[PDB]
């Protein structure tokens, strides 16, 4: 069961439109009965339904209107065939307070890694283009941190404002900052841990702000 939701983020008071494809092991349409349960962020079902794929060619369009007073965070939609209730397929859609942004921010480092003995430091390029294909002028804040396991620690001496002209700016994290931010002076013992770049961009109009994290 391959569940497809039109959007990937919904606001409360907005309807959810999703489909439930029904295919067999050989990837062909099949006529079977499905069950669907839509879970809260905590994991308590809110809606239950039963449908048949017979004479529907393996597509079951459905709907749900999100209640106004609901919890935030990830929601889940779990669907499973009626004959085999112990195998369950799922997708996640997020309910959040948002207004659509105006431009996408892309941060791609020059190399998809950081050599530990490199004396030049991490080389990250921040680029910002409007949604419909025009370049952005603004100021971008960035920050770096060390992500080990599940705990994220940021580098206080690393946040920088690098103004972007013609929609591209470049900042470098000098290895001295990386070594001094962490409490282990042994550079070799730092291996394995992953950096993470959090870039915040604001236009010179100051009307819109967007965050992008790599």
């Amino acid at each position: 069961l391959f569940i497809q939701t039109d959007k990937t983020i919904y606001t409360p008071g907005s309807t959810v439109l999703y489909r439930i494809f029904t295919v067999n092991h050989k990837l062909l349409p099949v006529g079977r009965t499905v069950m669907v349960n839509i879970e809260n962020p905590e994991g308590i079902p809110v809606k239950q339904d039963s449908l048949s794929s017979q004479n529907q060619l393996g597509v079951l369009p459905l709907s749900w209107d999100i209640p106004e007073l609901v919890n935030m965070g990830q929601w889940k939609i779990r669907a499973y065939y009626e004959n085999s209730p112990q195998q369950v397929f799922s997708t996640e859609f997020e309910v959040k307070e948002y207004v659509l942004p105006s431009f996408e921010v892309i941060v791609e480092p020059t190399e998809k890694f950081y050599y530990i003995y490199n004396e030049k430091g991490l080389e990250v390029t921040i680029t910002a283009r409007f949604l419909y294909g025009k370049k952005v002028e603004g100021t971008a804040f960035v920050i770096f941190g060390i992500q080990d396991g599940e705990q994220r620690i940021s580098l206080p001496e690393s946040l920088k404002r690098i103004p972007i002209e013609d929609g591209s700016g470049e900042v470098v994290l000098s290895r001295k900052v990386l070594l001094d931010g962490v409490q282990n002076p042994r550079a070799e013992d730092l291996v394995g841990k992953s950096l993470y770049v959090s870039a915040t961009v604001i236009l010179h109009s100051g009307s819109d702000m967007v965050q992008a994290e790599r």
């Binding site: 079902p45 804040f141 946040l159 404002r161 604001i202 010179h204 109009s205 100051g206």
Partner: protein, 614 residues
């Protein structure tokens, strides 16, 4: 609340059929009971999937051999020439009744054997008589001993008949009468029984038909040694089989207060079967273990049916919770908060939780948290604007964005912005700096740090060039870069203290009245005819005769006690006439003119002038 069964790892030693009828029984009984136990416990995944087919083949071969060995009178014996043995026939009946599930057995053979036994093998008193003892009686269990042997044989044959009673219930109608006679005979002389094996078998025979009541249960319970088993002096195999029949009797009676100790004693006994003269005990113990499974004593008793008495009383909402729905969470949504009655019925236990969600009034929670903005403007067209910030936290602030959004037709003085950008810890984007001029009504200032102990703040001049009245109040907004939901906002207006616009609000129904109080008429046009003619415009709705009675003040407005005399021209309201009326006016309107009590006034207005609720 259950005991794990044997893993059957060491039960591999459980023999091809061979020999005569007795030897074939010796061969089949352990293998048949072992495969039945494995089927019941569903442990074939580890014992070896392949061996079951060989077991079935060998047991089928033995069954076919014994079908060939069946006497024409449906009798089973060691030899066809030898006289049939009642015990052998009963054992064959039991084996067939056990193996009908695994292999095909002719029910006609069983019915014929039952009829043959009933016809001449029993006394009218209900005593089962053995006409030919088996040649090899060393493996018949407790029946070898002659003390109370007749009662033991009676109980064994009665159990064999009753377990096959349903199979030949239609063919044989005299079986229930013989069963009742045997039970009466067994219960007549129960007190004479002394051996634990004989007592157990007699009690099982009595319980399988339904006369185990009264002091018999007390005697059986008091007969227990250490409350785990019924033992007798001699071979321990007799004790094992006696405990087996005891636990079958308990399971038939469904007495859960004694099964766990018995099964624990059996488990710690570690009887793997085999040996010499242990066929009956092994068969009984493995049949006991198999019957324990698929009827495991546990606490599955969840059949709750819960109904809700909704306050709306539209209908009755009920739902049922079963074992298959023990993890089924049903959510009920109600839009009304009122007491409702819940009824819980059925065996089992359930959980109820109710949660309500709503909006709570703010407990003096302010929008500008953890910042302190104090935006001021003052005349020096020049205006010196100075924005003073602070951080309410315990530490020095991170990088913050001091945003500015100018009014209508006001621009920053480009001379000051140069040294502001040049200064320390205040950076203004080059793009915003180079354009400037009349084109910019929006300036953004980045702060390196915001002091959390003192107030370091800036001040630069803004000019005017468009000269338009009715200026829009500006804005100032600060926020640390790491988030946007936590910020602050202040509005600066040259004349209004905070530029919040005039908003006459009562209780919580706010509305704005951005207009003049009245016309500043100096009575220059004494010709009231023109005013009367102009008053007939569509923008005029009601004209009233009013006389002020009392004058009162309030927080941000002043109220006057009107005395209506007559409604000159409609009003889209009740005329009333002669009752006190209240007029709500802005507090600024007192300066423009103050109404005098006990004076006649003329006023005309439109529909929106009547504000409030009737």
């Amino acid at each position: 609340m259950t005991e794990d069964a044997v893993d059957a790892e060491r039960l591999k030693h459980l023999v091809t059929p061979s020999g005569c009828g007795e030897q074939n029984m010796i061969g089949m009984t352990p293998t048949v009971i072992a495969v039945h136990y494995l089927d019941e416990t569903e442990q074939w995944e580890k014992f070896g999937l392949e061996k079951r087919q060989g077991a079935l083949e060998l047991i089928k071969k033995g069954y076919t051999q014994q079908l060939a060995f069946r006497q024409p009178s449906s009798a089973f014996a060691a030899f066809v020439k030898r006289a049939p043995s009642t015990w052998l026939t009963a054992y064959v009946v039991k084996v067939f009744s056990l193996a009908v599930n695994l292999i095909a057995i002719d029910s006609q053979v069983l019915c014929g054997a039952v009829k043959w036994l009933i016809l001449e093998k029993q006394k009218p008193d209900g005593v089962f008589q053995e006409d030919a003892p088996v040649i090899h009686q060393e493996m018949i269990g407790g029946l070898r001993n002659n003390n109370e042997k007749d009662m033991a044989l009676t109980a064994f044959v009665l159990i064999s008949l009753q377990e096959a009673k349903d199979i030949c219930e239609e063919q044989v109608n005299s079986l229930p009468g013989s069963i009742t006679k045997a039970g009466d005979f067994l219960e007549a002389n129960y007190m004479n029984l002394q051996r634990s094996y004989t007592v157990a078998i007699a009690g099982y025979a009595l319980a399988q038909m339904g006369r185990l009541k009264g002091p018999l249960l007390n005697k059986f319970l008091t007969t227990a040694k250490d409350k785990n088993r019924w033992e007798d002096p001699g071979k321990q195999l007799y004790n094992v089989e006696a405990t087996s029949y005891a636990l079958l009797a308990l399971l038939q009676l469904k007495d859960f207060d004694f099964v766990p100790p018995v099964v624990r004693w059996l488990n710690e006994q570690r009887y793997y079967g085999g040996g010499y003269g242990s066929t009956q005990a092994t068969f009984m113990v493995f049949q006991a273990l198999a019957q324990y499974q698929k009827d495991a004593p546990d606490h599955q008793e969840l059949n709750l049916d819960v109904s809700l008495q909704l306050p709306s009383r539209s209908s009755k909402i009920t739902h049922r919770i079963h074992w298959e729905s023990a993890s089924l969470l049903r959510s009920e949504e109600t839009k009304e908060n009122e007491g409702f009655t819940v009824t819980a019925e059925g065996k089992g236990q359930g959980t109820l939780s109710v949660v309500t969600m709503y909006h709570a009034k703010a407990k003096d929670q302010l929008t500008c948290n953890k910042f302190d903005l104090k935006v001021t403007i003052k005349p020096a067209n020049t205006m010196i604007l100075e924005i003073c910030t602070r951080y309410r936290g315990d530490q020095d602030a991170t990088m913050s964005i001091l945003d500015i959004s100018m009014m209508t037709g006001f621009a920053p003085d480009t001379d000051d912005l140069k040294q502001l950008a040049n200064g320390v810890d205040r950076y203004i984007s080059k793009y915003e700096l180079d354009k400037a001029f009349s084109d910019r009504n929006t300036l953004i200032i980045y702060l390196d740090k915001v002091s959390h102990s003192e107030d370091d703040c800036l001040a630069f001049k803004v000019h005017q060039y468009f000269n338009v009245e009715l200026i829009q109040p500006g804005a100032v907004k600060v926020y640390a870069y790491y988030n946007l939901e936590e910020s602050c906002t202040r509005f600066y207006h040259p004349e209004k203290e905070d530029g919040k616009l005039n908003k006459l609000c009562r209780d919580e129904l706010c509305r704005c009245a951005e207009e003049n109080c009245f016309i500043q008429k100096s009575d220059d046009k004494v010709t009231l005819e023109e005013r009367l003619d102009k008053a007939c415009e569509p923008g005029v709705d009601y004209v009233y005769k009013t006389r002020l009675v009392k004058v009162q003040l309030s927080n941000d407005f002043d109220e006057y006690i009107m005395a209506i005399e007559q409604t000159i021209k409609s009003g889209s309201d009740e005329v009333q006439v002669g009752q006190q009326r209240t007029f709500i006016s802005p507090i600024k309107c007192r300066e423009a003119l103050k109404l005098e009590e006990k004076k006649h006034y003329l006023m005309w207005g439109l529909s929106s002038d009547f504000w409030g609720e009737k």
